[model samples]
Target: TEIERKFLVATFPDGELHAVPLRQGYLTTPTDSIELRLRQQGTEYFMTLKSQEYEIQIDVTQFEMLWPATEGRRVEKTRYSGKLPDGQLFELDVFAGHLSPLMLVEVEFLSEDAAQAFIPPPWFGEEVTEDKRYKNKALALSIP
Candidate 1:
């Protein structure tokens, strides 16, 4: 089995909380898109990336299961995401989105040192990776 690491929860002043490690991946329903995500409190941080594509999530306000090729979990909003630094390519996700007032951003790594050694862009507010409130799976059922 692969190493599955879990971190503490992080929260924001505007009643936003997120859990870790921020889940990431693609949505099978959309079929042709990428997703980057982080889960906090009752909201999800999502960034969608693609090339001139259009789509409409069937069930935007409903909770659903996010079953990637490796594992499965239930989520509120499944964001189809994309966009990444040049030369790097991967997928990430949170179960829900927009349940809180503030927004969030995240980047995953191949190693712990890599995750620790990296620096967040100016857009990132604080490091909430250690907070359980930001967990995607938890966000699916959490109440604001």
Candidate 2:
């Protein structure tokens, strides 16, 4: 279970660069609630099928896989691992190319309780956890 929350960041501090040229695409699904993603973080790659609802976290079954597709719906971005004052780790994403200027952040938690207990620092913006548009699957197929 991937328990997490997303925030639309208005501002953030510099973070250690984590991954670049991260690319992903979805396998067609009949429903929007479930998504299959094949992703490459530079040379490493993986495939994940995830079930999502509006609120925060998702249920995912992921395995390391070779690249499956080079075309179709995809999202590209760079990721950074940033630490908050309280030592909470957040994944900061800087969308690249067509999705530039779009920035989002997420923090994973062991449970919903743990997620709720997190205190976001001043740099974070409005909470977008329950918002479907922020989900990567939607973003992948969407034209911004």
Listed in order, each prediction's TM-score against the native is: 0.38, 0.69
lDDT of 2 at 45: 62
Per-residue lDDT tens digits for candidate 1, residues 16-42, read 233343333344323335432322223
Q: Superposing every Cα of model 2 onto the true structure, what RMSD results?
A: 7.2
True lDDT of residue 14, candidate 2: 64
Model 1, residue 60: distance off in Å is 13
lDDT per residue as tens, model 2, 21-78: 6877766553767765676667666666668422222222232333344244778888
Once fitted onto the true fold, the runs of candidate 1 whose alpha carbons sit more than 4 angstroms away are 1-75, 78-80, 83-98
CA shift of 133, model 2, Å? 0.7
Error of 2 at 51 (Å): 12
The CA lDDT of each predicted structure is: 0.39, 0.71
Candidate 2: worst-modelled 10 consecutive residues by lDDT: 54-63
Query: Judged by lDDT, which candidate is best?
Result: 2
